[PDB]
Amino acid sequence: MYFEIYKDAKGEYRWRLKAANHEIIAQGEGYTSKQNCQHAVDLLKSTTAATPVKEVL
Amino acid sequence: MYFEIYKDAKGEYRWRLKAANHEIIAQGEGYTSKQNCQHAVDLLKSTTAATPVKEVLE
């Protein structure tokens, strides 16, 4: 399991989590600068199993 | 900091990471089932700072 940061064809930065077999497990959304994208990833990984999951009803 | 799962106009399910001042940090992707969306979130939160981050670039 590892994260992967790249630049798409349109011209924006994005991320995606790959499995052991290099299989895509989750896709992220676009960003302006590479800096902002990297900050988002660090926040996601600083997330614990105690982070609440809420649904809008 | 918390995750939020909701539905758009296309009928797809998606998530987002909100912060204190109701500020969106990260955005999900379209999902065809509330079940699949919840599984993605659990996998994301099961990652730690030890999880490797590989970045490619021009």
UniProtKB/Swiss-Prot annotation, chain A:
Gene3D superfamilies: YegP-like (3.30.160.160). It comes from the Bacteria. Belongs to the UPF0339 family. This is UPF0339 protein NMB1088. The lineage of its organism: Bacteria, Pseudomonadati, Pseudomonadota, Betaproteobacteria, Neisseriales.
